[PDB]
């Protein structure tokens, strides 16, 4: 049966029901509220567990599947589509948030480059590099947090190398192919727990707000993000599809509707990836040759919704601090929000972990994330859907562009 | 020649001879006593080095060898036998130690679940998660120590997935098969150093006791553990064998006598595993199809002797602190001593590393292990033999149970 | 075109030109001098990134390629040549530096043995063990820094095991063969950035010296190292070649001249390894059977120039501190400088990272490396060439010795 979507929709409505009723008709202490969320914590453990094997294997196999530079044009065309749509999303976000106004830079910018090239691969798998100036002289240290941006850069370069080796590298192509499949089979196992975990992860999040004045304060911030995500997903992406693929874009989006609902409930572009393959191949009849690369790479590299959210959220917190952003600061937000979408993994609440980078790029305390944290579970559900939809339209686009070489 | 056992028996009697003579006829300072133990430290380095490759590869290959759910019944029947015998050992230990009386809980219990699902596999390979409440709000951090409990859970789930993939996963079945064999060949290399390391590791341990009043104080604690291990290995395990396999159990145990002596000297269920295969297959004529799974998995998951020792040791230290354990606390010791036997690796002195968890489950300082540490090298030799014997009887039992499906 | 050497020679002369002109005609602050070096920092990131995959895979494949103990004599003969030439280099360095005089030991010596056998392979990939005595009792802790000495020992032992397994281990032979090749293909990608990175890494190093009185102070230290490296490479190595291979040694060295210039510019024995294979096989016509083992293992194990430099540098800093070295201390420098050359990786500035060990072996502060750091980029270029030349002559030597078994 079509259990995945119906069970998760039930968990969402049961999570809201539980949270609203428990928040009103009970008085949990700050400690009891933490144990109440525990079944959702264990879900977040299981998903953070799997993003290391998943990102590594999907980067390597995706790139290594480009047998030669002729097929390499399919991969190249896709990464151009990824960067183009992400910048348009960030620019749209900045234009909105400075129109609505809902409210050490060099070191944070060079730290982006240092984190693409980590000094150690094993350390990069769980720690990330930060530099500070003191007395100035620069001092750097590692702090915990998977260096996803550096593992991506290595896995793309390492994937490219393996594919060029031909029959000499095939054992590594085969090893990471099997490891990629084994990882997607483990993710499908987590999907059995995910409905129950999503219930407590939704219920616990709305139990942890003391007053709706917190929700009213952030109402105009949600309007800015949800306005941007609406414009991006309903105007921009359908338009650039139609400009390339002279077919109705909403006909293509309607075929993904089962994947978009999944993304809108589980808040994980990586976990909805099996449903994305199902829709893209069978409803939209896209060539499996390209869907094997554009979907699994784009499921983490191409996060248009996160990039927009990061830019709106960072400028919003700057406005809350009266930090009147100059055009130079706006540009450093744009660059960091672009990189933060790439560095962010496709698991629930990955946008917040990278939010610290965009805040640091303008010197804002890393703890000012706690100004927006309360509503994030709502905007996370919508940004995830744009993270998938951006890849879906890209799959149809890349087919039309590549048709001379497929 | 049969060098392994005769050389290790010599090292044990030479270690006692050296330690007793050096303790009486010399006056090493606390510093010189540490350098005297150094050849035994390097042995402990070599064995801690190998338990990561060994646990990972033996979990994956053991489970992945269950070609289908028909053979999967052999693996399922075994894990039921593992859990049953371990609980009986823990319950026996608790009953004894409260009869003889030789003398934050929720956070430590939820930390067990958080450590089955680590946020990072590379971090889990060398760090383990602990939470504290402060101001309450819960704060968590990682501290060093291989998260064996989380690597087991992943390797069993990852092994299950690979086996279901069939011909698509065979490269990973083959890779971990070779890596499992390569690890057992390295362990056989350490066995050449082990006699010399065991000499200094035994001699140094009895040089580090200042007075025999330490040994007299712990005499009734040793009587409780060694009474429990005697009852478990001479009464309970032979009985549950006979109740399943209507054959004389001591005839089967006599065939293992060469493996039991090895375990009783090297204090390592993992290092004696090659001898366990030799006896189980050739003396006891057990089907190689089942011995390939019950022995190498049970060599670390099924540690009946450690589980009994953990429960007796934790209640003993509680009695030393006048911490009069309620029935609720006794239950939390039972659950944690069960998990601590699984989390403990099959290398000399692995019971102490996990002892900290059972102590923490009742709020006892982690340093109160130093109350029992002095005698542990003796009880380690006996608990190791029950850790092997539990797997040996399980191998004969699982054969009888599975005979309809072999 | 022969772009590698001509482009790097240009970067060196352009780096000196830039550094001298910027140092005179500009006044960078200590902060601006750090950002000026940044394009060279990113080069050091890329090379430190790759030494973990490179050392692991080259140890395993090199040893695992010795199909049997008959070919094993080729590998055995080589490691005898490695240790012999390294000790001769260290002894030459000690004799010089005590003739010219240009100016807790047990714990540091046992720490060498503890670091050959790490308690964890994943921790060894990025941390290294150090012990201290306090109140004495010994306390140990891990600190960051790849434990190259322990990864080598495991990879040689693990490589030996795989080769003995035959057809049962071939999947691991194949896996590390492909991973070794994939790593050398990534290093060849870094070579495209290396000219630009070498320019700023040379220019920035001479911008960071305030006065030439620093260079005059260290002039007699450079004379001691460069005298030792001249004697070792022009006298000793040609002699031991001629004593084994009764052919003109400078005819063989002239065939390597393209590899020696590469080593003398990029300061990386590992990065010049492809050029070393090219010269050794095609100019010097050495059997590919032996060059496949003596070059890639010797590219990190056999560092005769580093070992000489380490001994001269450590005794020099002792003389600066009036620490009048007894014959016992000289011996502990010899042992630690030998091990430090093995522990040092073949990337620019790897000698300094291990310098801390030789200083610690005689109790000198780890920060007294900053007494010699200023000139190190110059001596690094010359020591790298002796690190390659030692392997080159060894390749011709091992061919003559092994000719009865090839
Ligand atoms: N939850 C988003 C990631 C994010 O929130 O940044 C996704 O999986 O696409
Ligand atoms: N030494 C035991 C483990 C322990 O003491 O906990 C064994 O190897 O079975
Ligand atoms: N740069 C040297 C290593 C060192 O300086 O210690 C080499 O690659 O051979
Ligand atoms: Hg929420
Ligand atoms: Hg002992
Ligand atoms: Hg320099
Ligand atoms: Na994009
Ligand atoms: Na995406
Ligand atoms: Na991303
Ligand atoms: Na058991
Ligand atoms: Na066991
Ligand atoms: Na265990
Ligand atoms: Na040498
Ligand atoms: Na070398
Ligand atoms: Na070296």
CA distance C111 to C127: 13
Give the helix/strand (H/E) hosting B246.
none
C49, C146, C175: residue with CB nearest A117: C49
Taking the CA of residue C243 and the nearest CA in chain A, the distance in Å comes to 40
What's the token pair of residue C203? Answer: 């220019």
Closest residue of C to B347, CA-based?
A: C119
CA distance C126 to C56: 13
Range of the domain at C262: 2-405
User: Which residues are CB-contacts of C271 (< 8 A; sequence separation ≥ 6)?
Assistant: C47, C187, C190, C191, C194, C346, C347
Q: Which ligand is closest to the CA of C343, given by its number?
A: 15
CB B264 within 8 A of CB B369: no
Q: Which residues have any ligand 3 atom within 6 Å of their CB? A: C 267-269, 303, 306, 344, 346, 348, 350-351, 380, 383-384, 387
**Interface residue A70 vs chain C (CB under 8 A):** no
DSSP A137: E
Cβ atoms within 10 Å, residue C213:
9
3-state secondary structure of C120: coil
Query: Left, alpha or beta for C166 (phi > 0: left; psi -120 to 50: alpha)?
Result: left
Residue nearest ligand 1's atom 1 by CA = A348
CB B62 within 8 A of CB B280: no
What's the token pair of residue C50? Answer: 């790759």
Q: Which ligand is closest to the CA of C349, given by its number?
A: 3
DSSP A284-307: S---HHHHHHHHHHHHHH--HHHH
CB contact under 8 A, C38 and A110: yes
Is residue B229 in contact with ligand 2, taking CB distance under 6 Å?
A: no
Chain C residues within 8 A of A164 when measuring between CB atoms: 185
* C267 annotated as belonging to a binding site for a ligand: yes
Taking the CA of residue B130 and the nearest CA in chain C, the distance in Å comes to 19
Best mutation target among C108, C119, C136 (most B Cβ atoms within 10 Å) is: C119
The CATH number of the domain where C276 resides is what? Answer: 1.10.3860.10
3-state secondary structure of B130: strand
A18-54 in b/e form (b: 16+ CB < 10 A) is: bbeebbeeeeeeeeebbbbbbbbbbbbbbbbbbbbbb
3-state secondary structure of C36: helix
**From which experimental method does this structure derive?**
cryo-EM
Closest residue of C to B125, CA-based?
A: C122
Interface of C with B in 84-113 (CB under 8 A): 106, 110, 113
3-state secondary structure of B345: coil
Is residue B302 in contact with ligand 2, taking CB distance under 6 Å?
A: no
CB C404 within 8 A of CB C290: no
Cβ atoms within 10 Å, residue A367:
10
Is residue A298 in contact with ligand 1, taking CB distance under 6 Å?
A: no
CB contact under 8 A, C178 and A168: yes
Q: What torsion, rounded to 10 degrees, do the Cα atoms B306, B312, B313, B318 define?
A: 150
CA distance A246 to A263: 27
CA distance C331 to C51: 30
CB contact under 8 A, A117 and C45: yes
* Backbone dihedral angles phi then psi of residue B139, each to the nearest 5 degrees: -120, 135
Quote the number of domains for chain A.
1
**Interface residue C135 vs chain B (CB under 8 A):** no
CB B256 within 8 A of CB B283: yes
CB C40 within 8 A of CB C198: yes
CB C266 within 8 A of CB C21: no
DSSP C279: I
* Backbone dihedral angles phi then psi of residue B98, each to the nearest 5 degrees: -85, -25
Q: What torsion, rounded to 10 degrees, do the Cα atoms C295, C296, C300, C301 define?
A: -70
CA distance C290 to C78: 9
Q: What is the resolution of this structure in A?
A: 3.0
A323-360 in b/e form (b: 16+ CB < 10 A) is: eebeeebbebbbebbbbbbbbbbbbbbbbbbbbbbbbb
| Rg of chain B, C-alpha, whole Å | 21
CA distance B349 to B383: 11
């Amino acid at each position: 049966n079509n259990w995945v979507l119906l069970s998760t929709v039930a968990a969402v409505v049961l999570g809201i029901t539980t949270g609203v009723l428990v928040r009103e008709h009970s008085n949990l202490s700050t400690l009891e509220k933490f144990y109440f969320a525990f079944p959702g914590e264990i879900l977040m453990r299981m998903l953070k567990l799997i993003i290391l094997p998943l990102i590594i294997s999907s980067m390597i196999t995706g790139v290594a599947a480009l047998d030669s530079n002729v097929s390499g044009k399919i991969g190249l065309r896709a990464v151009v589509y990824y960067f183009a749509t992400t910048l348009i999303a960030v620019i749209l976000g900045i234009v909105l948030v400075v129109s609505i106004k809902p409210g050490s830079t060099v070191d944070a910018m060079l730290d982006l480059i240092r984190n693409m090239f980590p000094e150690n691969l094993v350390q990069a798998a769980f720690q990330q590099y930060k530099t500070k100036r003191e007395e100035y002289k620069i001092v750097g240290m590692y702090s915990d947090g998977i260096n996803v941006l550096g593992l991506i850069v290595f896995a793309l370069v390492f994937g490219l190398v393996i594919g060029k080796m031909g029959e000499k590298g095939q054992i590594l192509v085969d090893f990471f192919n099997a490891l990629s499949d084994a990882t997607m089979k483990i993710v499908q196992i987590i999907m059995w727990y995910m409905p129950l975990g999503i219930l407590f992860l939704i219920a616990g999040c709305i139990i942890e707000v003391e007053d709706w004045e917190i929700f009213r304060k952030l109402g105009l911030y949600m309007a800015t993000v949800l306005t941007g995500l609406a414009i991006h997903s309903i105007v921009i992406l359908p338009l650039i599809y139609f400009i390339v693929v002279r077919k109705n874009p909403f006909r293509f989006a309607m075929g993904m509707a089962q994947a978009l609902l999944t993304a809108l409930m589980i808040s994980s572009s990586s976990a909805t990836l099996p449903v994305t393959f199902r829709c893209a191949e069978e409803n939209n009849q896209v060539d499996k040759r390209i869907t094997r690369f554009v979907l699994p790479v784009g499921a983490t590299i191409n996060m248009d919704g996160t990039a927009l959210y990061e830019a709106v959220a960072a400028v919003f917190i700057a406005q809350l601090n009266d930090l009147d952003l100059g055009i130079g600061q706006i540009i450093t937000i744009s660059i960091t929000a672009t990189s933060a979408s790439i560095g962010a993994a496709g698991v629930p609440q990955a946008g917040l972990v990278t939010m610290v980078i965009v805040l640091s790029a303008v010197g804002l305390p890393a703890e000012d994330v706690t100004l927006i944290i309360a509503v994030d579970c709502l905007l996370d559900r919508f940004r995830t859907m744009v993270n998938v939809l951006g890849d879906a339209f890209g799959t149809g686009i890349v087919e039309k562009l590549s048709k001379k070489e497929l």
